[PDB]
């Protein structure tokens, strides 16, 4: 409602680096809200694209941004009789960043990994990794939960059970309020998906620079289901956390499997033990129900109402039998005796191939009226196809039917504006949360300050 776009602030990264692919705020020790922006294609030290993370300080003028000095160099270690080998090449270090208020958990899902024992190897694959970094103390810490070392001759002899080599862990990462780190590995157990929950304080404590294979010993991965619905589910493709089971100590994950049950897609809710609480099947196939999950109380009832993006949902019209516009669901968590799972609201896009719903951002109380207000984005919506960000306030029974205000992209066509948003973080202390939109196609990030 109040995200006046006349005077933005544009943060720009190296040209050709997708600067803005994934972003999140980071409150420093002084309360100086600095923007973390992930650029999965920034050139490294070998003239190769190996990601990079740009901790943007909040400047009312935007511009360039100093990067976070991370490890972009391939590391090899002859531990035991195995050639432990990491290939930090095309790893996309920044494909999904997140900050636990002093730690920048910037992940690299496509970071390969290979171990050799004199004839054979683990079939080098993107096990992914998540480089952690405190901007104040500057102590790096890696965390790759899926760096196995079982030879490929054993996986083929176990019907690929516990085949967490393809994890791409850090594909979608969220850090709980208590301090855990919840990676989304939508390749774990052979593209069936998993999660890794290792507390942040227990990653710094148990990280020795130099050894590649190590188990945190406090982590907890998901389980390899054998239900043919789960196969090729890309489970954990986009995860979020909330409170869906009463115990305020534990937290509940909102894992979204977009290709679930033969492309139908379902967003599962599950407690800290990965035991399924809820499961929200999608309407129609090939719509990525669950490509982008979000969780916020959109009706001020104390319940964590989740939202599920369906970027490729094909609505029904009178001209096109099914014209692909996208759809954002709203599963209000019932405060009564019934259960979550009935879609309370169905927000649908307007522009064909706009992928309306590929990135939802719980801005929180944007206009200070009690109820939180998400902001959906269509990376190719609008009347021209340069992107669009729509702000849906939530009145009392869920969200508003019509978007309060749209944010037409100020970047040229192809910028994919809206591919990554973040909200509910006041970046200059107007008292109001300020939405920042990641236009990775134009290698920039736009900051929309919410003037009251």
């Amino acid at each position, epitope marked *: 409602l109040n995200l006046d776009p006349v005077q933005l602030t544009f943060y720009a990264g190296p040209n050709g680096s997708q600067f803005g692919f994934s972003l999140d705020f980071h409150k420093d020790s002084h309360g100086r809200v600095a923007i973390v922006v992930g650029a999965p294609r920034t050139l490294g030290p070998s003239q190769e694209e190996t990601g990079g993370v740009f901790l943007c300080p909040w400047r009312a003028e935007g511009g360039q941004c100093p990067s976070l000095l991370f490890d972009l160099r391939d590391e090899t270690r002859n531990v035991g009789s195995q050639t432990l080998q990491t290939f930090k090449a095309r790893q996309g270090l920044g494909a999904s960043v997140v900050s636990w208020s002093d730690v920048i958990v910037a992940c690299a899902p496509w970071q390969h990994w290979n171990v050799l024992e004199k004839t054979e190897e683990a079939e080098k694959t993107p096990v992914g990794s998540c480089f952690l970094a405190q901007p104040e103390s500057g102590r790096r810490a890696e965390y790759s939960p899926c760096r196995g070392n079982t030879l490929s001759r054993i996986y083929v002899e176990n019907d690929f059970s516990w085949d967490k080599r393809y994890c791409e862990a850090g594909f979608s990462s969220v850090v709980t309020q208590a301090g855990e780190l919840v990676l989304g590995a939508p390749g774990g157990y052979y593209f069936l998906g998993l999660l890794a929950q290792a507390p942040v304080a227990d990653i710094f404590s148990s990280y020795r620079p130099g050894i590649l294979l190590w188990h945190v010993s406090s982590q907890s991965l998901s389980f390899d289901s054998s239900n043919p619905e789960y196969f090729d589910g890309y489970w954990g493709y986009s995860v979020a956390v909330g409170e869906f089971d009463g115990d305020l100590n534990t937290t509940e994950y909102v894992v979204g499997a977009p290709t679930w049950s033969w492309t139908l897609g379902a967003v599962e809710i599950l407690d800290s033990y990965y035991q399924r609480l809820h*499961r929200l099947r999608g309407e129609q196939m090939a719509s990525y129900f669950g490509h982008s999950v979000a969780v916020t109380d959109v009706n001020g009832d*104390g319940r964590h109402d989740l939202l599920v993006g369906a970027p490729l949902y094909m609505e029904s019209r009178a001209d096109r039998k099914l014209a692909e516009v996208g759809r954002v669901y709203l599963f209000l968590q019932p405060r*009564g*005796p*019934h259960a979550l799972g009935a879609p309370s609201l169905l927000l649908t896009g307007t522009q064909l191939y706009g992928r309306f719903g590929s990135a939802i951002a719980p801005l929180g109380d944007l206009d200070r009226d009690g109820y939180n207000d998400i902001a959906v984005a269509a990376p190719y919506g609008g009347p021209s196809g340069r992107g669009q960000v729509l702000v849906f306030l939530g009145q009392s029974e869920g969200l508003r039917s019509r978007p309060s205000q749209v944010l037409d992209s100020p970047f040229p066509t192809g910028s994919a504006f809206g591919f990554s948003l973040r909200g509910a973080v006041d970046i200059d202390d107007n008292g109001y949360p300020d939405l920042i939109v990641g236009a990775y196609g134009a290698n920039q990030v736009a900051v929309y300050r919410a003037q009251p």
Partner: antibody
Amino acid sequence: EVLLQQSGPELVKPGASVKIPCKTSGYTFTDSNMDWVKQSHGKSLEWIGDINPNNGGTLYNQKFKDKATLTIDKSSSTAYMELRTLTSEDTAVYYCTRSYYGRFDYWGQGTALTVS
Amino acid sequence: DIQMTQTTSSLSASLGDRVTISCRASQDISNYLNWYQQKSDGTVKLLIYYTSRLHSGVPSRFSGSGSGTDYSLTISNLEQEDIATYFCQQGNTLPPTFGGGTKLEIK
């Protein structure tokens, strides 16, 4: 420790209403709803109506929807169900349960009702 | 609505033993199914919820192994304090309908 300590046994002439108060202690009141369940003589219990402490929600069973005017006292952490037009067939025990994430955790006592 | 049925309305076995309270759902629900222990003279409390989640103030003997429509409560080491009427509640779709109630008897 939260106890939903309810009222005592009542007796009502037929055709006259009756009020069943359910006090809540501990447990800041507006965290969860305050449902209601009627247990008949055959010890088969079916629930009556929901109500939302923040704002009167009054979600009913569509079988008791008429004669279960559910009320609430947010300030005094109390909850009512004000049964109306009572008949001889609706003499039962009326629990004052609490919903909390779609369960009925905590019920408390149970108000014996009698119609003569 | 959804009609919940407990076939055996009166189950019986010796103390210190395991018994399984059955419960069926007319319409296929998910894994939403609570369990309530009601002993003599009221004082009904909540057992395992969501078909297996022990409540805060309940022993660790109770456990449920239901999925789909066929739900159960397999109580282990039946003590003297576990004789009660056990009601299964569906809590998926309004209105949540309880079960028929299984009377327990120590033998």
